[model samples]
Target chain A: GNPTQLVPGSNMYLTSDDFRSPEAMPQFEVTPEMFIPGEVHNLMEIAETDSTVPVNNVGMAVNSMEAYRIGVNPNTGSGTQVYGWPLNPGKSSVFKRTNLGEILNYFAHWSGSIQLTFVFCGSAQATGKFLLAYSPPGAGAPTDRKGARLGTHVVWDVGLQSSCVLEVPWISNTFYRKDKSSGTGFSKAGYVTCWFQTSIVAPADAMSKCYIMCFVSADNDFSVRLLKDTPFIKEQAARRV
Target chain B: SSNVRSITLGNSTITTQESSNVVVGFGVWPSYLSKSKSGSGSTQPTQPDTATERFYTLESVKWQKTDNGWYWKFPDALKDMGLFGQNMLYHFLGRTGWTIHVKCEASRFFQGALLVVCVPQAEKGCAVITRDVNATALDEGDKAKKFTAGSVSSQNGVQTAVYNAAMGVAVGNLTIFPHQWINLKTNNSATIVKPYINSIPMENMYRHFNFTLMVIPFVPLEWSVGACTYVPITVTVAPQNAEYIGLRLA
Candidate 1:
């Protein structure tokens, strides 16, 4: 084997012609850019409040961008607690850009004990809502065995808010519309606004640190995938509009 | 620094201005029970099944079931607000905060949520159309229909709820065309415990929606300034006794 393969091995060692033009190679191999520059954002781990038992299931926000591996396998157990990164107060997963882009293909994992749920939230119009329907002690069941037409028995939690809304009060009437007070053809135009919130079946603690591993691009649009647990949420929540 | 506040219901409540499938207006995705109207000329109103295949949820607010309807509320200083629909808090925010819109929907009988957001600062050029309706105005039940843009009035138009049930008005240029609806003494509201439905007995639910409309000049912006728009926000309230207000902004 050595004798036969040697003829090809030695010849392959001294390749490349300096005098002639360089041969074309895969553009990916030649370029040293990581496609996205904001690739690995180091995050902070939010401290768990001592008062609440397990309320602080890990949480995150992506007004910023990217991928983060803060979870374990769902089917299997024995996973360890991996609180994300540490952050300042008022900014659990809150990061902003003077301007932003669209977000899609998002995913999350609160615990190794939960199931996987992918859902469609709302749009920029009429305040979009992404909710987690929870049934407390005595409420009626909001779902069937297969998950069908159930009621909204969402109760708020201590650490996790059912949903958070963002508003832009500054330009309520004049950013881009001119209208007639009364009559047939009044027009409302050019307003592109978006306010996003985050959710996970809140464990019992704080998810103050949101590990950020941004693989960035786009704005105004966002889609999230949850990797957390809670018996309440069985399917994906809301519409994507 | 950021500031956060919760909204509570002060009094009057409302529903969808633009009627669509299974929608309760104002983006409220309440429970809609799958029902078969078992009736011999008369049927029973199906109660909302809070449990069952209740999958997608927008937000979980504190809620309970009422006899003919359901009782829902918020958490933090919100438990006292009572019902969750169009109220003074949301209306005030819609006019002063960013802007508000309820999700539009159709049959799959999709559910909607009330979205509230805030930002930058409240700029000018916004004019407001307000109504100070007294409890006496809505004293009677509006059994006609809750899906139509009725009884709801706009500025310059009749200031009263000509239909004599629920009432409202458009402020800017957000014109609500009255859609001819079937008399639900007939039952959409009755069969499905909704606000603003008067046709049936025990009809004591109310609806109030607050919104805005901005007309943009599209005629090229240069040649059609005249063809553009100047609000003739002629406002008039019904029930000569009802009170209303209008603040013009340029």
Candidate 2:
């Protein structure tokens, strides 16, 4: 088989050299020294009648310039697809980010069959992200239906790539009502938000990223598609903004 | 051109002059239908059908705009529209529910129309259907619910003591709209339900529709009922009043 023809629902990772020098015509400024690290800080899942978790107390830290991200696919179903921005270049169809370069901080909350909450603090810069969904309902699976080369579930895109004063609420749609007046139903009322950033000094050709989140509804309902099916949605003007 | 005129006979003297040419137009009386004069000199005036119009005081309806759909009112001009005269009352049977049946005859004319069947909490508006050509067939009358069949013990195999019609509205979101002619047939007994206003079904009988009524009366001039696989129906239509009877949605 042609080397490019991998499995349909595969999670691949990209390396710094891969992103900065993408054969697909690289468009991002990826450098080792400009990288800032990101890490998963907290996660939780609650039933319809379950108590809300103390999600705000979770914390994360980065050593040097390495940024950590999560690949959460709510385990269920078959034939559902997931997409990723594999940074290791080994084709591990999952979220991959090398370094985050910026100031201020980050806060995020994820809830569903597979829930995760995370935060990041560092130098400041503008960032762009995407909100995506996937299936086959389980951890590590690629929710590729949302997008492929574009990454999934609010994965940092290029529009969010400039600036000096990024801070709290950077990616804050999660757990908050978009209108705040659509009543107080948890699944129907609140939204989820994700965040990310990249560095400026690795190698001009050494930065890349991607992530996936999946979910299933009650009673093995096959009608559900995650990221899009869930109450959570992406923020505005991610591309050509 | 007043081709015909009606004089009101009641506590008031109101006369309604009409142009017999427009079979579907409304006329307001300066006085009652019983007190008007048969104007002198014939333009060879043909007697107006007056079969339905003679039953009400022309003054009862105000010829203004209706932006909101419409409200229920008893037409002083005509009796209820239904297959059986007992079904003609258009009574608001709240405890049990409203009931009526429609039958079209040899002329393909409706046995009657069901308009504004109301109770304390729920109600239905007048509706009718017809076609330009007799291209459709009718279901056995068994499809219509029998409200007058009286008590559960009376229906024998038929569902008895059905949920009160009001309950149907509260639970099933039951709604109905006005009627318009569908069509007539060559068989003389042929009939078609539903009509077109600017070539669009007024009652939206087969699908979900977002109804928007204007307080300004006839602008977009279209009204309709939500479509349903079962339940929504066309019961009767008239060349005059029945043709104008659709419910406007908000």
Candidate 3:
């Protein structure tokens, strides 16, 4: 669909600036000069940025995002919340499981009683699902904790059948404090994401922080660049009277 | 940067033992003043031979009645006042009995200073307090009811002194009122506003808690030998006390 000066000697008045535009722009296209590995903006030459994700440590593979885009009913006994990775949709698709672990390590302080249940669907329609939990580092067994998975290991398939291409993917967890005491149970209906959750509880001594490091074959494709970096920092307590 | 020496915890006025490494961050040392290390000579000096300066910060802090001023001292009292006033110390004393002590002698002493202004919540341009050097310790710490407080009327007054003290440079005054905590986010990842102790500035310096028979010692310590009168000065919050941001559980 690009109609601006692609031919070796075309009549299009493509200025230097126009040629410098991302290949996705009408006046420019990806050139051999911009194709440097381990850099952003290469694929952004095309508008296909949204459908791809790249995990720095993981192998080159695009993530196939099948979103459930579910609205959470606070009162619903069993419902799910919306979930997405890298926040924006369809930027870089290639993901490494190791990178996932790095991302999860950033959220070490999120501790609540209520649990968020997640099931990775082999197919988009939640046909084949896997129940995932967390496995803290020092836990002796995966089942030692009621809800958490084994040491860094997430267990899948709470109850399922064959034919579902589900590999335990990390799941987002949100604890809902129902009043002061009895909180709500886990909900599997929120944004049906593709991450795994280890069915492991956190060990006593160490704060339970989770991260996923794996490879994903994004069913989608795109090239994009991201200049913004998230600062992974927590605040230390300030002295008070 | 200044190094944190010691800190005291709990509501008691009794200061903790010195060299215990209680004060987690800087601003507890009496030697809050600094001199530039311009020479690159390898023979590093053991002690900071730079002219010794006397200063004290609070274990906790509190704002003044007018809201324009505040008073505080090092959390730990046993340490030499010089230890509590050093730079680059991130002292932390939590309810969990967790006493975090951080000391760095590098140039980045004030790199993490939370740029908070200690102003009266209701008043817009109330006079603030800058660094004030008092050769004599106000002898009225216990005996005197009140003394004259100074005002930092100029825009550059408060900040200039803060930067000076943080960088180990000398400012004219001793009192500094910084704003509450900055750069703290919630579980939802949203930055939230920081809260204060009694008021905007931490005037919670607790000396009355130490008085025997309910009577404090004379106000101000007599320094400068011939000077018979004590020097009254506005107080500032210790970085050790300020570095430990409090959290409100929802």
Candidate closest to the true structure, highest TM-score: 3
TM-score of chain B of 1: 0.17
Provide the lDDT at B86 for model 2: 24
DockQ, per-model, please?
0.01, 0.01, 0.01
Give stretches of model 1 more than 4 Å off. Answer: A1-64, A67-73, A76-78, A87-241, B1-99, B104-250
lDDT of 2 at B25: 10
Q: Which stretches of candidate 3 lie over 4 Å from their true place?
A: A1-76, A82-241, B1-250
Q: How do the residues B61-113 of candidate 2 rate in per-residue lDDT, one tens digit apiece? A: 21111211122212211223332212224321100011111222212111111
Q: Per-candidate TM-score, first chain only? A: 0.14, 0.19, 0.19
Q: Each model's number of backbone clashes?
A: 82, 110, 116
Clashes of 3: 116
- For all candidates in order, state the fraction of native interface contacts they contain: 0.00, 0.00, 0.00
TM-scores, all candidates, are 0.15, 0.16, 0.19
Query: How would you encode candidate 1's per-residue C-alpha lDDT over A1-241 as one tens digit per residue?
Result: 5555445445343454344456577465653332211123311101110000011223421110111212211122211221211111111121111011001111231111111111121111112222233222233222331221133322222122213222211111211111222111112211111111223221122111111011111212222234233222345556432
TM-score comparison, 1 vs 3, better candidate? 3
